[PDB]
């Protein structure tokens, strides 16, 4: 049904994302248990880490386009990522390695992420209809990888420990690298223009030097968030000031403010929503005992189901507004499950958490898929810069928001934590409901401006 290179790209993507989510799903619990952070520290640090993971993507896109090539940067990024995962394994012996390891992962991701998408959209002539299908299939592969990692990574960590987990993440990166290399043949005429000239060692050296400077800067930032806050505040206010000095770009700015809200919301799945599942939800479903951390796998799961369906089934400000409403509903459902359908002992049905994740995934299916690709139809380099900037700012802010649900180590009564989760979740759901209402109000104006 699809070209031969499609399936290569599909599986390299699956394994890379398997490693990444194998880390994300266990990271905050790792900060709390293994490094003895308090939940407030773990949440803000996870914030900084995601912020860099998503802020650095722009760079990898540019390095693949104009310095090194696309297939080269896929190899380079996979190698730096495997090194990061193995470093994180080695952090258990050497704890002071942890931040450096995370920085490596961030930089590794920043170099790698944008390229396979580029590679994929060159396996097809410019108007081949199959494109859309492949893209959704591409998304599904990401989510299959995510689905598997979040399912098994915590189980593995509990029965064998964080070193074995992280090394499995590495091993998955190595598997992706071997697939790509053993299929170099299939991509012999595919790539960007630097993939067919010989490799400039000058540029390669600059990319290595800068990668390493960026690794040490990531590590400095995740250990000292207080200054990461200021770095991104100044960078953001200044890039909006040079956006406000310099009609479709204004609709892009409104769409980015809403995407920022949606990313603040997405940031909760690995932190506060995770700890809500740990603390106030039954750890059994259909009679099976499950590790509560595995509940995060519910996000990719619904995506994997609903994206075919929803790909089989207005336009831009409308779909954005729809997604906003969906996320609003996810948090109102969480708060309501806490406030009214709890046991005498403060525990709640995991079916309520399944519904939360369904609402969240639908919101993702609208906002995340559309906004990035269609901010590009509204448009440019400066706005990807600012788009990744503000998404990173969103993750920082999400971590700060998570801290409102943080629980001291000595609390052991679900009935004492339950009111805290429901107060924060209700307030979140209500604020984003107001936001989606204003969005709806502004929808027709924006549609006229887009035309």
């Amino acid at each position, epitope marked *: 049904q699809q070209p031969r290179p499609f399936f290569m790209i599909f599986f390299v993507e699956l394994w890379e994302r398997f490693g990444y989510y194998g880390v994300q799903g266990v990271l905050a619990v790792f900060f709390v248990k293994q490094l003895g952070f308090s939940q407030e520290q773990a949440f803000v640090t996870f914030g900084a880490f995601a912020a860099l993971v998503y802020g650095l993507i722009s760079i990898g896109g540019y390095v693949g386009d104009h310095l090194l090539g696309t297939k080269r940067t896929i190899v380079l990024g996979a190698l730096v990522l495997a090194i990061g995962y193995f470093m994180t394994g080695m952090s258990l012996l050497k704890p002071d390695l942890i931040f450096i390891a995370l920085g490596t992962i961030a930089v590794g991701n920043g170099l790698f992420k944008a390229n396979p998408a580029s590679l994929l959209s060159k396996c097809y002539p410019p108007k081949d209809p199959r494109l859309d299908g492949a893209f959704t299939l591409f998304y599904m592969s990401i989510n299959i990888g995510s689905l598997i990692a979040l399912s098994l990574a915590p189980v593995i960590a509990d029965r064998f420990g964080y070193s074995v987990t992280y090394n499995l993440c590495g091993a998955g990166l190595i598997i992706a690298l071997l697939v790509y290399i053993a299929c170099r043949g299939m991509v012999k005429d595919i790539g960007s223009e630097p993939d067919f000239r010989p490799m400039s060692f000058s540029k390669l050296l600059y990319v290595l030097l800068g990668s390493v400077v960026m690794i040490f800067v990531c590590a400095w930032l995740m250990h000292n968030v207080e200054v990461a806050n200021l770095v991104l505040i100044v960078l953001s206010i200044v890039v909006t000031i040079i956006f406000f000095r310099q009609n479709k770009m204004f609709v892009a700015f409104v769409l980015m403010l809403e995407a920022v809200v949606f990313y603040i919301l997405y940031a909760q799945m690995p932190t506060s929503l995770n700890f809500f599942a740990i603390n106030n939800v*039954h750890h059994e479903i259909l009679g099976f005992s499950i590790n509560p951390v595995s509940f995060q796998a519910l996000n990719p799961f619904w995506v994997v189901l609903a994206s075919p369906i929803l790909a089989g089934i207005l336009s831009m400000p409308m779909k954005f507004t729809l997604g906003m409403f969906m996320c609003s509903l996810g948090f109102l459902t969480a708060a309501a499950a806490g406030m009214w359908f709890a046991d005498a002992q403060g525990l709640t049905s995991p079916w309520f958490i399944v519904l939360v994740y369904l609402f969240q995934s639908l919101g993702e299916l609208f906002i995340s898929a559309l906004g990035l690709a269609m901010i590009a139809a509204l448009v440019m380099g400066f706005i990807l810069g600012m788009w990744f900037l503000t998404q990173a700012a969103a993750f920082l802010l999400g971590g700060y928001v998570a801290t409102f649900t943080a629980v001291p180590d*000595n609390i052991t009564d679900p009935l004492e934590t339950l009111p805290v989760y429901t107060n924060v979740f209700g307030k979140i759901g209500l604020v984003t409901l107001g936001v989606a209402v204003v969005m709806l109000l502004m929808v027709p104006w924006l549609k006229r401006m887009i035309a």
Partner: nanobody
Amino acid sequence: VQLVESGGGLVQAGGSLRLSCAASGPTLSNYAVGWFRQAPGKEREFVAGINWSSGLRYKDVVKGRFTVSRDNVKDTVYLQMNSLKPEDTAVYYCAARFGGMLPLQPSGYANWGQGTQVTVSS
């Protein structure tokens, strides 16, 4: 998933037993461990427990007398029972729930030891 209880016995009032809960596959470090007891003719009731980061919880009637503690090296959880009274006579179960919470009812706990008889005589 599977806990091994040990330490039960017959003791005279004012005497002292120590129960112990260890686990097989998983590490008990990621678990709150509660000790429940079922007296003849009654339902399982929460005695005392310790969460995954050393938070403690106790039933009123055992405060002062029962101490919960955790050896993370040996991967074991201990319950010291001093000043025992005849109403402490029961089957004692340990239960493990992942994380930092210690709910009061047996339904908040998915992994369960086999039970151990404790008898305290007058």
